[PDB]
RNA sequence: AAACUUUCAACAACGGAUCUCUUGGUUCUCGCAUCGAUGAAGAACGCAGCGAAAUGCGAUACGUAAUGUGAAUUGCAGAAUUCCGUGAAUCAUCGAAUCUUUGAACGCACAUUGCGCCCCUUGGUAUUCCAGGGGGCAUGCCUGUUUGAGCGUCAUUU
RNA sequence: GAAGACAUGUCAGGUGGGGAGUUU
RNA sequence: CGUGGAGGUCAGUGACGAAGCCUAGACCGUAAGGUCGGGUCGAACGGCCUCUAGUGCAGAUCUUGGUGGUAGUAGCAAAUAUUCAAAUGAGAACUUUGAAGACUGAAGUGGGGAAAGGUUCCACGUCAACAGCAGUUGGACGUGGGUUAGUCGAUCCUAAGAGAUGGGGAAGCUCCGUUUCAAAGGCCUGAUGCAGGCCACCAUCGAAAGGGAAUCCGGUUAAGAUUCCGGAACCUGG
RNA sequence: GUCGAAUUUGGGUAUAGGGGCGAAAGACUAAUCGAACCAUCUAGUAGCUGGUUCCUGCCGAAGUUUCCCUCGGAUAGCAG
RNA sequence: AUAUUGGCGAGAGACCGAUAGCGAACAAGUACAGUGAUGGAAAGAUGAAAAGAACUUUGAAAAGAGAGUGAAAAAGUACGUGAAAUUGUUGAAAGGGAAGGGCAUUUGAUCAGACA
RNA sequence: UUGACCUCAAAUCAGGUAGGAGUACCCGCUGAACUUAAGCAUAUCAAUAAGCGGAGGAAAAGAAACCAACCGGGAUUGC
């Protein structure tokens, strides 16, 4: 079963830029680090448990800390964002 | 006869020089150019006519103003005059 | 050979006009000799001198007009920036910096802080 | 070897740049070395050739000849030296299209700009 | 180019038995009119099976296989027999593998490194390079492949204190780290047993 | 035996085939976003001392203005004068000018360098006619200024 | 003046080699 | 076995001659092919282990280019026809002059014109390219000159017809409409700010043979004229 | 054959492709018409005609068994 | 973070190398054909320097023979190297309505090698 | 009789904007056939070819009337 009864040749994409894209990403990261020199370049993320029991056994990183978690930690969501702590209201 | 005698009466003219392009494609009866689309505001062009597009695409002519835009952008569209050291 | 632009810059408008008239007369006289002489390369210098005088006069007039419109809003378009159509219509520096009072208060209260993970 | 990415080792690019270099850039291309005596005097190895300079031929059939430069043919990349000519069949004399890279300068034309250049290049004229 | 050989409006004239049925170019009064097109055997037409960019250029090789190949290449250097057959002037060197003091890594200038290599028995190998320099044969000279030369000794170091830059300019000589040894450098041309000059720190760190 | 047909070897004839190079072509990768009514692209016509084509330029016309290098351009003539220089370059750079008609093309048209209107200035003794020069008159829509219409309609009244 | 809740966008029934695809 | 390239190697060959080509010259292998001798030639190429492919031609009425027999052959036979003397020229039937003989026979092989062609028009020099022979000549080649308008045409007006505008459809490129269901113009002229007054209709293009405001003769160039010069009139705006 | 007319014709205008036109022949529609030309889908579709390029050594066939709108495909055999 | 057969400025390719590679390595979207939408080519190389044959002679001239530059004129503006098809001159051979080929030898020409 | 409010006009009014070219990428509309199924209409070709409208270096989308049924995941986009 092969799906090639279309003009697939017009949509063929070859990732020649794999090395070039990697170099650009590394250069971009360094550029931001220079721009973000005082900060660690990323926001701390929470501990999260996954759905889909096939994966719930493994802990995973979340998008951001909940409002209740931030409040219990002894700060505020607005201050947390400026301090570098990811916040997720959902 | 459809042969050579028919060609004898070929003394009239259907097309004429076009004001916009002057390619001799301005029809007299229709008062329109079949090549550049005159007098229609939009220049006539089509994707199926790849060769036709090249013959009239930008850069084929003089490019009196567009040719200098790159240098001005490189200089940041600076204004004034040189400080002379 | 040829009229120097800086020398002309020190002359007055009437002097520039007189010099232009004299150069035009000289160019006309030389052209009469060109059709007789086998070759008259000297004609090139006077033709460019006329252009230099005209450019100097135009520059002086434009600079005078600029003073006539110095600091006045809604000035002649030709004196305005020639950057490009898109940039001309783009929001100005002040317009792009417009921030609502709510956002101003939010930024003032909680501006981005400089923090490092050291201890 | 090549390190910076702003330069290229492509043969075609270099050939096109050399054969299409503008007259202003061809001045640097048409440079000649100075004699060891001049090197010790001014403390410099080479300088761009000038029409009023004197150069000694050190290569080719005309080796050993010397004279003042007559003209600098930047268009032809060659240099003409006074008295370095070949006689045609009809007796006409034509200059020899020499190259500054094959000649040694014996005396410089110390123009003000040239004087500044020598000092600019770490020279020792004064 | 995918568009090469197809930028024409040639059409077949049918099987009227006066000329081949190859699609002939239209128009007239230009010479090209009436010429065949779109054929692989036709002049100026698209070649048979035009080359495509999605051809498999890179080849995947197992990591364990790569490590095995590197280890095998390393061993050939210590035999002292494959090196001679490879074409390295290791006849007069004291012993194989060659181990040099850690001070070799701290050499600053190229002249000092060249002198040290000459004194440590690499003089013959260094002289082998710069003597075989010959112009490339064939069309390869068009694409910057002009000059070719034989490989020189390979210096292995544990720390980069300037040795890599000192030996950069000397022709044929190459430098590599123990933690980043290359099979291509160790066995150029699929031939094992390249002459390698190990340093004390590099030799100890190999364990 | 000569004449004539054919093969080989040397040389010489259409031919440019083989070999060697290419300011050339094709593919990948990298960095950026910069056309136009403040008149885009394109097109017609002209500009060099000697130029047909290319390129550049637009009656300031293979260029004008400003800055960098400092001794040319070159096929011939010519000028060189600027050669210890506020200065030669078919030089580079380029922020200042010119930028014919046409072209979204914009006074109306256009197989016509055709046919109109407004303002300023000049001459023919002319506000009325003609002519020379300069500045203007295209369509859709937005904010504001002015002048108007609608027993749509309010108070104000005689 | 005549006319007028009638004539005058969406589905459904009829006719439709005037026109299109296909089979023989 | 052989070819275009790549990794390695021979510290390979090479301006005291690389490659290619010619060579009833030779050697090796059953063969694909490899090597050497000589001539030409002028700047890169060579043995071997591997990798790589746009890698091997006698056919496809195969694509481009070039060249033979047919062949110095068919043919250069419509339109009645040329001949003698002189001149230029190296060269003359075709060029120029003189003479003779003929043709178009006014519905001509003449004098003008529109469309068309656009410098073919005239002057000087030339015969390498063309005038299916030839050519001193040419609508050929190289260098120059020539087109003069108030009175001739375009320009102005309108027919078939084309064609915007306010609007009506169309997702849209754009289709319909020429007064249709528009608040659609400035003209007389007085103290030009403001007063009085008539008309009802409202782009534009569309003929060098439709209509039209007006010039006739004489002379003149190598080539222009009713346009240029002499003379004599006419029409329009003032 | 006709030649005082349903005459011939110059310029302009209108009719443009499943359309136009046709005193009507599938006749004309720019030497192309029972459906014009230009560029793209398109290197369209074949159970069909033709071609399919260097050397040597070894081995080495087949026309019958079944099915298929079957009188080109699957299948056993031969054989490697 | 993602796409990019267009524009600008660059770095590279186990890519092609004048019938190849973009149609265009060159005054290429040029010459040229069509009213037209469109179609659409062929064409790189002297030598390092033109140093491009001054000069004598034959010929009207084109050009040839001498002389000269150049390393080369077997580089002469028809120019790097210079193949086959086809053609001419010189040397050899054969030929009574075909030629060409195979085994075999005579005659003519030509040719390599080594000799206590 | 005078001055206002609402609508609608005229302005070569003062200050502005829009057409168009390019279009490889994007955002929408519109939109086939050849071919394939050894015939062919469902279907494939294809939500493609052509045509039309709209901007930028990216465009679009974007902070869930979402996914899950979990010990819950937590803007959008890409591999």
Q: In sequence order, which residues have a C-beta less than 8 Å from that of residue B52 and are 6 or more positions away?
A: B45, B46
Are C31 and C79 part of one and the same domain? Answer: no
- Residue A1 within a domain: no
Q: In sequence order, which residues have a C-beta less than 8 Å from that of residue B13 and are 6 or more positions away?
A: B28
Q: In sequence order, which residues have a C-beta less than 8 Å from that of residue E172 and are 6 or more positions away?
A: E126, E128, E129, E130, E149, E150, E151, E152, E153
A83-to-A40, A47, C107, E108, E131 alpha-carbon distances in Å:
11, 18, 14, 47, 65
Inter-residue long-range contacts of A10-13, CB under 8 Å, 24+ positions, other chains counted: A12/E53, A12/E54
Nearest chain B residue (CA) to C79: B79
For the stretch B6-33, what's the b/e string if a residue is b when 16 or more beta carbons lie within 10 angstroms of its beta carbon? eeeeeeeeebeebeebeeebbeeeeebb
On chain I, which bases lie within 7 A of the protein's CB atoms? 10-14, 28-32, 38-40, 42-43
In sequence order, what DSSP letters do the residues of B13-58 get, joined into one string? -SEE--TTT-SS-EETTTTEETTT-TTSSSPP--SS-HHHHHHHST
Instruction: Choose from C83, C85, C86, C90 for mutation: most chain B CBs within 10 A.
Output: C83
Q: Which helix (H) or strand (E) holds D86?
A: strand D85-87
CATH of the domain at C98: 6.10.250.3450
Q: Give how far C106 is from chain A: nearest CA, Å.
A: 9
- Residue A41 within a domain: yes
Query: How far apart are the C-alpha atoms of E156 and E135, rounded to whole Å?
Result: 30
Are C7 and C46 part of one and the same domain? Answer: yes
Are C41 and C65 part of one and the same domain? Answer: yes
Q: Which residue has the tokens 């290229």?
A: D8
Provide the 3-class DSSP secondary structure of residue C32: helix
The closest nt to B57, taking CA to C1', is F41
Chain C residues with CB inside 8 Å of B77's CB?
81-84, 87
The closest nt to B85, taking CA to C1', is F67
Are C94 and C67 part of one and the same domain? Answer: no
- Residue A4 within a domain: no
Distance from residue C32's CA to nucleotide J75's C1', rounded to whole Å: 50
Instruction: Choose from A36, A84, A85, A87 for mutation: most chain C CBs within 10 A.
Output: A84
Burial class for E186, CB neighbours closer than 10 Å (0-12, 13-18, 19+): buried
Domain range enclosing A44: 12-90
Chain B residues with CB inside 8 Å of C82's CB?
77
Instruction: Choose from E144, E145, E171 for mutation: most chain D CBs within 10 A.
Output: E144
Q: Which one, of E196, E207, E205, E181, lies nearest residue E99 by Cα?
A: E196
Chains A, C in contact, 3 or more Cβ pairs below 8 Å: yes
Output DSSP code: residue E46: P
Query: How far apart are the C-alpha atoms of E40 and E25, rounded to whole Å?
Result: 15
Cβ <8 Å between D11 and E168:
no
On chain K, which bases lie within 7 A of the protein's CB atoms? 14-24, 44-53, 56, 64, 67-75
Using alpha carbons only, how large is chain E's radius of gyration in Å?
Answer: 28
Token representation of residue C114:
């400089």
Burial class for E44, CB neighbours closer than 10 Å (0-12, 13-18, 19+): middle
Are C85 and C60 part of one and the same domain? Answer: no
Q: Which one, of D101, D104, D109, D63, lies nearest residue D84 by Cα?
A: D63
Are C108 and C118 part of one and the same domain? Answer: yes
Q: Which one, of E145, E149, E151, lies nearest residue E186 by Cα?
A: E151
Query: How far apart are the C-alpha atoms of D71 and C24, rounded to whole Å?
Result: 36
Q: How many domains does chain C have?
A: 2
Distance from residue B39's CA to nucleotide H201's C1', rounded to whole Å: 31
Chain E residues with CB inside 8 Å of D13's CB?
none
Chain C residues with CB inside 8 Å of B69's CB?
84
Q: Is the CB of E150 under 7 A from strand J?
A: no
Measured in angstroms, the resolution is 3.1
**What are D86's strand-pairing partners?**
D94
**What length does chain A have?**
90
**What are E176's strand-pairing partners?**
E156
Which chains neighbour E (Cβ–Cβ under 8 Å, 3 or more pairs)?
A, D
Q: Which one, of E160, E162, E165, lies nearest residue E201 by Cα?
A: E160
Are C10 and C57 part of one and the same domain? Answer: yes
Query: How far apart are the C-alpha atoms of E91 and E124, rounded to whole Å?
Result: 9
∠ CA E26-E28-E30, nearest 5°, is 110
Query: How far apart are the C-alpha atoms of C17 and B19, rounded to whole Å?
Result: 39
Q: In sequence order, which residues have a C-beta less than 8 Å from that of residue E47 and are 6 or more positions away?
A: E5, E40
**What are D80's strand-pairing partners?**
D71
Instruction: Choose from A82, A85, A87 for mutation: most chain C CBs within 10 A.
Output: A82
Chain D residues 2-31 with Cβ under 7 Å of strand F are 11-12, 15-16, 19-20, 22-27
Phi and psi of E179, rounded to 5°?
Answer: -75, -10
> Which domains, and CATH codes, for chain D?
1-126 (2.30.30.30)
Burial class for E102, CB neighbours closer than 10 Å (0-12, 13-18, 19+): middle
Q: Is the CB of D89 under 7 A from strand J?
A: yes
Distance from residue D71's CA to nucleotide F73's C1', rounded to whole Å: 11
Q: In sequence order, which residues have a C-beta less than 8 Å from that of residue A39 and are 6 or more positions away?
A: A84, C114, C115, C116
Provide the 3-class DSSP secondary structure of residue D33: strand
The closest nt to D2, taking CA to C1', is J11
Q: Which one, of C55, C44, C57, lies nearest residue C15 by Cα?
A: C57
Domain range enclosing C84: 74-119
Phi and psi of E131, rounded to 5°?
Answer: -105, -25
Q: How many domains does chain A have?
A: 1
Phi and psi of B66, rounded to 5°?
Answer: -65, -25
Query: How far apart are the C-alpha atoms of E7 and D119, rounded to whole Å?
Result: 61
Which method resolved this structure?
Answer: cryo-EM
Q: Give how far E203 is from chain D: nearest CA, Å.
A: 29
Distance from residue E36's CA to nucleotide H64's C1', rounded to whole Å: 9
Q: Are C52 and C2 in contact (CB under 8 A)?
A: yes
∠ CA E183-E187-E191, nearest 5°, is 140
Are C68 and C88 part of one and the same domain? Answer: no
Are C23 and C67 part of one and the same domain? Answer: yes
Angle between helices C13-34 and C43-68 (to 10 degrees): 160
Q: Give how far E168 is from chain D: nearest CA, Å.
A: 8
Query: How far apart are the C-alpha atoms of E54 and E56, rounded to whole Å?
Result: 6
Q: Is the CB of B24 under 7 A from strand J?
A: yes
Are C64 and C84 part of one and the same domain? Answer: no
E75-to-B33, D27, E82, E83 alpha-carbon distances in Å:
80, 57, 10, 11
- Residue A90 within a domain: yes
- Residue A7 within a domain: no
Distance from residue A61's CA to nucleotide J95's C1', rounded to whole Å: 105
Distance from residue E94's CA to nucleotide G9's C1', rounded to whole Å: 104
Are C5 and C21 part of one and the same domain? Answer: yes
Query: How far apart are the C-alpha atoms of E98 and E80, rounded to whole Å?
Result: 10
Nearest chain C residue (CA) to A81: C112
- Residue A86 within a domain: yes
Distance from residue D4's CA to nucleotide H133's C1', rounded to whole Å: 76
Task: Report the 10 Å Cβ neighbour count for A79.
Answer: 13
- Residue A5 within a domain: no
Q: In sequence order, which residues have a C-beta less than 8 Å from that of residue B45 and are 6 or more positions away?
A: B52, B53, B56
Query: How far apart are the C-alpha atoms of E121 and D121, rounded to whole Å?
Result: 43
Q: Which residues of B define the annotated binding site for Zn(2+)? A: 18, 21, 33, 36
Nearest chain A residue (CA) to E58: A16
C44-to-C58, C93, D66, D118, E152 alpha-carbon distances in Å:
21, 49, 38, 37, 66
Query: How far apart are the C-alpha atoms of E154 and E195, rounded to whole Å?
Result: 6
Query: How far apart are the C-alpha atoms of D47 and D106, rounded to whole Å?
Result: 12
Are C10 and C63 part of one and the same domain? Answer: yes
Q: In sequence order, which residues have a C-beta less than 8 Å from that of residue D49 and are 6 or more positions away?
A: D30, D31, D32, D55, D69, D72, D79, D100, D105
């Amino acid at each position: 079963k092969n799906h090639f009864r279309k003009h697939w040749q017009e949509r063929v994409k070859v990732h020649f830029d794999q090395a070039g894209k990697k170099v650009s990403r590394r250069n971009a990261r360094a550029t931001r680090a220079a721009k973000i020199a005082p900060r660690p370049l990323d926001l701390l993320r929470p501990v999260v448990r996954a759905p889909t029991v096939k994966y719930n056994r493994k802990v995973r990183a979340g998008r951001g800390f909940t409002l209740a978690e931030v409040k219990a930690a002894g700060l505020t969501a607005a201050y947390a964002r400026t301090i570098g702590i990811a916040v997720d209201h959902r | 006869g459809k042969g050579t005698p028919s060609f004898g009466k070929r003394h009239n003219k259907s097309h004429t020089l076009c004001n916009r392009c002057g390619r001799r494609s301005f029809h007299v009866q229709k008062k329109t150019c079949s090549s550049c689309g005159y007098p229609a505001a939009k220049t006539r062009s089509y994707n199926w006519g790849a060769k036709a597009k090249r013959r009239h695409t930008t850069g084929t002519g003089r490019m009196r103003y567009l040719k200098h835009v790159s240098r001005r952008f490189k200089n940041g569209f600076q204004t004034g005059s040189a400080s002379k050291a | 050979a040829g009229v120097k632009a800086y020398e002309l810059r020190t002359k007055s408008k009437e002097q520039l006009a007189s010099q232009l008239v004299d150069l035009k007369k000289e160019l006309a006289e030389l052209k009469v000799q060109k059709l007789s002489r086998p070759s008259l390369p000297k004609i090139k210098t006077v033709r460019k001198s006329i252009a230099c005088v005209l450019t100097v006069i135009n520059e002086q007039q434009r600079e005078a007009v600029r003073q006539l419109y110095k600091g006045k809003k809604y000035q002649p378009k030709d004196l305005r920036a020639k950057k490009t159509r898109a940039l001309r219509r783009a929001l100005t520096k002040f317009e792009a910096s417009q921030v609502t009072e709510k956002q101003r208060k939010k930024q003032i209260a909680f501006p981005q802080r400089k923090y490092a993970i050291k201890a | 070897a090549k390190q910076s990415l702003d330069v290229s080792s492509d043969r075609r690019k270099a050939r096109k740049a050399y054969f299409t270099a503008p007259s202003s850039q061809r001045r640097v291309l048409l440079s000649a070395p100075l004699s060891k005596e001049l090197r010790a005097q001014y403390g410099i190895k080479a300088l761009p050739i000038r029409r009023d300079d004197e150069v000694l031929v050190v290569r080719g059939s005309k080796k050993g000849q010397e004279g003042k430069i007559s003209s600098v043919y930047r268009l032809k990349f060659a240099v003409q030296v006074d008295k370095v000519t070949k006689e045609k069949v009809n007796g006409a004399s034509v200059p020899i299209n020499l190259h500054p890279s094959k000649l040694v300068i014996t005396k410089l034309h110390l123009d003000k700009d040239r004087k500044a250049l020598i000092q600019r290049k770490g020279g020792k004229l004064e | 180019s995918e568009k090469a050989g197809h930028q024409t409006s040639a059409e077949s004239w049918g099987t009227g038995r006066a000329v081949a049925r190859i699609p002939r170019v239209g128009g007239g009064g230009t010479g090209r009119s009436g010429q065949g097109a779109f054929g692989n055997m036709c002049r100026g037409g698209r070649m048979f099976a035009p080359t495509k960019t999605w051809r498999k250029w890179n080849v995947k090789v197992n990591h364990n296989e790569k490590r095995y190949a590197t280890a095998s290449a390393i061993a050939a250097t210590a035999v002292a027999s494959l090196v001679l057959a490879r074409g390295h002037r290791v006849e007069k060197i004291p012993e194989i593998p060659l181990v040099v003091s850690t001070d070799l890594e701290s050499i600053q200038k190229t002249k000092e490194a060249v002198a040290a290599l000459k004194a440590v028995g690499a003089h013959s190998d260094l002289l082998k390079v710069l003597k075989s320099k010959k112009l490339r044969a064939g069309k390869g000279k068009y694409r910057n492949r002009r000059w070719t030369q034989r490989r020189g000794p390979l210096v292995v170091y544990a720390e980069d204190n300037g040795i890599v830059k000192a030996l950069r300019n000397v022709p044929g000589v190459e430098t590599a780290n123990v933690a980043s040894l290359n099979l291509l450098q160790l066995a150029p041309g699929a031939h094992l047993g390249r002459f390698v000059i190990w340093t004390e720190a590099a030799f100890t760190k190999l364990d």
